[PDB]
Design an enzyme around this catalytic site. Structure first.
Site, mmCIF file in Angstrom:
data_model
loop_
_atom_site.group_PDB
_atom_site.id
_atom_site.type_symbol
_atom_site.label_atom_id
_atom_site.label_comp_id
_atom_site.label_asym_id
_atom_site.label_seq_id
_atom_site.Cartn_x
_atom_site.Cartn_y
_atom_site.Cartn_z
ATOM 1 N N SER A 122 -1.019 3.081 6.543
ATOM 2 C CA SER A 122 -0.827 3.637 5.179
ATOM 3 C C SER A 122 -2.105 3.705 4.374
ATOM 4 C CB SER A 122 0.240 2.878 4.402
ATOM 5 O OG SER A 122 -0.209 1.568 4.093
ATOM 6 N N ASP A 359 1.078 -0.133 -6.081
ATOM 7 C CA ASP A 359 2.393 -0.735 -5.867
ATOM 8 C C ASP A 359 2.190 -2.196 -5.365
ATOM 9 O OD1 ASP A 359 2.198 -0.541 -2.940
ATOM 10 O OD2 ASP A 359 2.809 1.566 -3.092
ATOM 11 N N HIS A 362 -0.045 -1.247 -1.663
ATOM 12 C CA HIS A 362 -1.069 -0.222 -1.559
ATOM 13 C C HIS A 362 -2.029 -0.130 -2.725
ATOM 14 C CE1 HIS A 362 2.581 1.098 0.730
ATOM 15 N NE2 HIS A 362 1.693 1.123 1.730
HETATM 16 C C1 LIG Z 1 -9.868 0.610 5.361
HETATM 17 C C2 LIG Z 1 -9.983 1.340 4.036
HETATM 18 C C3 LIG Z 1 -9.342 0.561 2.900
HETATM 19 C C4 LIG Z 1 -9.285 1.292 1.583
HETATM 20 C C5 LIG Z 1 -8.436 0.582 0.523
HETATM 21 C C6 LIG Z 1 -9.052 -0.662 -0.065
HETATM 22 C C7 LIG Z 1 -8.634 -1.916 0.045
HETATM 23 C C8 LIG Z 1 -7.439 -2.452 0.795
HETATM 24 C C9 LIG Z 1 -6.185 -2.402 -0.034
HETATM 25 C C10 LIG Z 1 -5.178 -3.272 -0.109
HETATM 26 C C11 LIG Z 1 -4.995 -4.611 0.563
HETATM 27 C C12 LIG Z 1 -4.835 -4.538 2.049
HETATM 28 C C13 LIG Z 1 -3.770 -4.198 2.764
HETATM 29 C C14 LIG Z 1 -2.422 -3.743 2.300
HETATM 30 C C15 LIG Z 1 -2.429 -2.240 2.267
HETATM 31 C C16 LIG Z 1 -1.757 -1.410 3.052
HETATM 32 C C17 LIG Z 1 -0.817 -1.781 4.176
HETATM 33 C C18 LIG Z 1 -1.398 -1.498 5.567
HETATM 34 C C19 LIG Z 1 -0.395 -1.752 6.695
HETATM 35 C C20 LIG Z 1 0.766 -0.798 6.788
HETATM 36 O O1 LIG Z 1 0.537 0.403 6.324
HETATM 37 O O2 LIG Z 1 1.826 -1.105 7.290
#
Ligand SMILES: CCCCC/C=C\C/C=C\C/C=C\C/C=C\CCCC(=O)O
Ligand SMILES: [Mg+2]
Length: 387
Positions: A122, A359, A362
């Site tokens: 995501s 959220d 994300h």
């Molecule tokens: C690698 C590029 C990162 C860009 C964004 C910046 C920081 C990270 C953000 C948030 C904290 C980390 C993880 C949670 C976010 C998304 C879920 C991923 C797993 C899934 O989708 O099930």
């Protein structure tokens, strides 16, 4: 992956289709809502593109460049909105789903990067689940047109900075994406990429910039072991390099346990995930060095180190809040992706560009942009890549 006879038959099945131009309705990134119009020519006639359809998810393959299609959408919409954030798709009519348009390369192409191919979850997804959900998930009033954010993701900012088309295979699991599509794993993504590119004309994999961020879905949602995630990551790089890939943007994983949803997780669950992220990051660095020592073009960005700075001192990086979602969501429940949510008081006051998280999981599009720009700076606007 596809026989030469199957490729010819598909490429010879020439037709035309129309272009759906999507845009953010508000001038503010606090408002995720979008709408669309059909692309038009200057004389008011319908803009059409010639080409062929193929599916193994239908892709439309055209000789028309992404820049020409983008220009037709910009002129048709005629918005004076800096936050319009225009995206486009192929569609025969009002009933059609949003189909990705692949612009075929020329036979005499120079030895330089001419497209971005994204793999991951995501953090890189640009709408892969949105047709499967009949455009209802994530709710298009609180999430930006199938993106799990209030705008563009880091890959779209990278591709735009370099004026390149972006083709996405990324899809996550933290929002309940697997209730809509199967085959979301990195191996399934590489397989899908290998299949669809056999249908492309004059495709040289050496001119593709590959982005790969993988492992958080597996650790957070499927409680997968560190060795099985390491093995899948190594396998993706083996398959891509064996299929002609030369250029990669690799990154360490941010500590996902810093996200608001973990306010509702036990300490034991948090420590388990955090330890897996740390072990994975050392393996990612070893893999980047392994391919760099072999002559491949590798850019490694330490997203983990940047995210630790961002969350511990947000006020030093252009943010007011790094602990709460911008949206007024105060629990972790996948059903919330089905609804519209208001912004919490603090976020409505500061604006969504001052929050790290959109959220409970994300990041906001400002966080995605910050990471994308730090990446371009680190690599000196991608110096060991030929543009
Ligand atoms: C690698 C590029 C990162 C860009 C964004 C910046 C920081 C990270 C953000 C948030 C904290 C980390 C993880 C949670 C976010 C998304 C879920 C991923 C797993 C899934 O989708 O099930
Ligand atoms: Mg495996």
């Amino acid at each position: 992956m596809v026989s030469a006879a199957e490729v010819v038959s598909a490429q010879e099945n020439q037709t035309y289709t129309y272009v759906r131009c999507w845009y953010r309705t508000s001038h503010s990134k606090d408002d995720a809502a979008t709408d669309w119009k059909w692309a038009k020519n200057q004389d008011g006639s319908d803009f059409t593109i010639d080409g062929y359809w193929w599916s193994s998810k239908n892709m439309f393959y055209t000789n028309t460049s992404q820049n020409v299609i983008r220009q037709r959408c910009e002129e048709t919409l005629d918005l004076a909105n800096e936050n319009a954030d225009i995206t486009f798709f192929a569609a025969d009519n009002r009933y059609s789903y949003n189909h990705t348009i692949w612009s075929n390369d020329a036979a005499m192409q120079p030895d330089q990067i001419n497209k971005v191919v994204a793999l991951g979850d995501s953090l890189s997804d640009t709408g892969n689940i949105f047709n499967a959900s009949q455009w209802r998930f994530p709710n298009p009033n609180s999430w930006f047109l199938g993106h799990f954010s209030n705008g563009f993701v880091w890959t779209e900012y990278v591709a735009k900075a370099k004026n390149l088309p972006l083709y996405n295979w990324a899809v996550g699991g933290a929002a309940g994406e697997n209730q809509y599509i199967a085959l979301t794993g990195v191996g399934e993504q590489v397989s899908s990429y290998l299949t669809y590119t056999k249908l492309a004309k004059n495709y040289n994999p050496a001119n593709t910039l590959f982005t790969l961020e993988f492992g958080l879905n597996d650790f957070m949602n499927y409680n997968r072991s560190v060795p099985e995630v390491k093995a899948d990551y190594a396998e993706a790089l083996i398959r891509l390099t064996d299929a002609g890939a030369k250029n990669f943007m690799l990154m360490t994983l941010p500590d996902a346990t810093k996200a608001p949803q973990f306010k509702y997780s036990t300490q034991e669950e948090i420590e388990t995930i955090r330890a897996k992220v740390l072990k994975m990051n050392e393996f990612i660095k070893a893999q980047a060095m392994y391919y760099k020592a072999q002559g491949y073009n590798i850019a490694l960005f330490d997203t983990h180190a940047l995210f630790e700075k961002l969350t511990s001192a947000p006020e030093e990086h252009g943010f007011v809040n790094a602990s709460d979602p911008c949206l007024d969501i105060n629990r972790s429940s996948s059903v919330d992706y089905m609804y519209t949510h208001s912004l919490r008081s603090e976020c409505a006051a500061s604006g969504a560009d001052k929050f790290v998280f959109w959220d409970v999981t994300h990041p906001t599009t400002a966080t995605h942009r910050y990471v994308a720009e730090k990446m371009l700076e680190s690599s000196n606007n991608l110096e060991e890549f030929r543009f």
